[model samples]
Target chain A: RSVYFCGSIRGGREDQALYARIVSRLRRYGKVLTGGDQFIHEQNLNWLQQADVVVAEVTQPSLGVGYELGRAVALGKPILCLFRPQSGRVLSAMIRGAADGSRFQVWDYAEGEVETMLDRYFEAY
Target chain B: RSVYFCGSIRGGREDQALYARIVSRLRRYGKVLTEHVADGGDQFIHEQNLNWLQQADVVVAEVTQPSLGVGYELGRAVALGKPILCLFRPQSGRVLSAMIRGAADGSRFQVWDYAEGEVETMLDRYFEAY
Candidate 1:
C-alpha cells in the first residue's frame, strides 16, 4: 500500500512528529512515498501519481493538507483524510465551498480502522 | 490583525495539531478568524477578499503547516497587495517551488527563521495587514 502522510508544519512541528509515526507504521504496508519532516530532501509530489492509497493525517486543519487532498483528487487517487478526532473538527463541508468537494473522504486517524475500510474498499473494487 | 495557516495534508496529521496549538496561542494576540479542527467547521478558503482576510491587516502564514490553500491565498494576497508574513520549516518542499518562494521575483514575500524567532521584528515592520 503506497501511502501518503499529511500534517501541520506550523502547529508547532507537531505535525512533523505525527508524520514520523505514520511513516513508521507504513513501512510494514509498503513504501511510504511522502518524505517525513526529518528527511525532507526529495521532491515527491510527482511520485504521488503512483500512490496506491493516500492516507492523509490532517491533525491540524491546514492549506497544505487541503492542497495535497486537491492533488490526490485531481489524480483520481484514493484519498482518506485521517485526522485525530480530538485534534479538531473534520472540515468536509469546505470542499463544496472549495473549488472541489465531491471527492474527499475523511476519517479519524486510526490504522486498524483504516485497514478495515481498505479491506472492504479493496474487496469491493 | 488576521492570519492564515498552511501545510501538507498528507505528510501526516502534523499540520492539524500544530494549527490547533498556533490558533490557541494566536487568540491572545488578536481575534483568530480561522476555525481549528477541534471546532469542526469548514476550513476557510476565500480567494480574494477572503471573508476573514478581506479586511485583514497582517497575514501570518504558517507554511510549514502543510497546505496549498495557504500558497494560493498567499499568491492572491500578493496580487491584492496584502502584507504577508510566512513561516516554514528549514527544509520544505513547498517554499522551494516558484509558486511560493525561490521565485525569480517575489514582490512582497519575506522568508523567516522559525528557529530563532527573528521574524517578530520583520512581522512588525512588514506584516502590516490592510
Candidate 2:
C-alpha cells in the first residue's frame, strides 16, 4: 500500500525521530511519500492522489499537518492518525474533531506503542 | 491602533518567551489580542475572535511556530483584506508557508525573518508609519 506520512517541519522538528520511525515502518508495508523535504518531496495534492492511505504523525500538532489532513479528507482517502497527546496540553480542536473513524481513525500511542499499532493497521489492510 | 497578534498555541509553545516579548512590544503601539488557549480560560467565544480581527487595523502574526488556528486566522485576515505582517525566526529551522509568504510579492501582506535583538526596532518601524 502506498502511504502518505504527514509530519511537521515548520511546526517543530522536535519529533524528527518519531516521524522517521513512522515513515520507515510504513515502508515495510509499501512505498511511502512524506511531505517532508527529505523523502518524497513533491506536490502535496499530487502525492495525496497517489497514496493508498494517509498516515499522519500528529504527536506535534502543526497547521500544515492539519491542512494536509483536511485535504486528504476532501480527497476521500483512507486516513490514519497517530498522535502522542501531551499532558496539560490541549490538542487542537481541528485534530480532535477529525478523529472519527467513519472516514478514518486516530490512535493516541505511547513511546513504544507505534510500531505495533502500525503492524496491526497493515495487517487489517 | 489595536493589533491582532498571531502566535502558535497548538503547534508548539516553545517560544513562549518570544511571543510574550512580541506582545509586550506591540503593547507600546496599541492593544494586542493574542488568541491562545490560556486566553479565555473557559469563556472563549469564537465569534469574539472574528470580531476582534474585524476591528483591528493591522494583523501581526508570528509564523515561527505554525498553528492551524493561526493559519485559519491568516486566511480570514486575507479575505477581509487586512494589512498583515508575518514574522519568522530563521534559526528555528522551519519554513514559512508558501501561501503566506507568496502574499508579500504584491498583496497587502508582508513577511520578515526576525532576530531577538532586532524585534523591537522592527515593530517600532512598522508602527511608526501608523
- The candidate scoring highest on lDDT is 2
> A32-92, model 2: which lDDT tens digit per residue?
9752332322366578779889988776656566556755665678888887765345656
Worst 10 residues of 1 chain B by lDDT: B97-106
After superposition, the stretches of candidate 2 with alpha carbons farther than 4 Å from their true spots are A35-42, A86-89, B1-7, B12-62, B68-130
Best by DockQ: 2
Candidate 2's displacement at residue A43, Å, is 2.4
What docking tier does model 1 reach?
A: incorrect
The residue-by-residue lDDT of candidate 1 on A1-125, one tens digit each, is 66766555543365675567666766666678762421231244556667887766655645545545555555677665655556544443443234333245655545445555445434534
Please, what are the lDDT tens digits per residue for candidate 2 over residues B56-128? 9899887877776565566567657789888887887767765455446333777788886788888887778
TM-score of each: 0.44, 0.58
Error of 1 at B50 (Å): 13
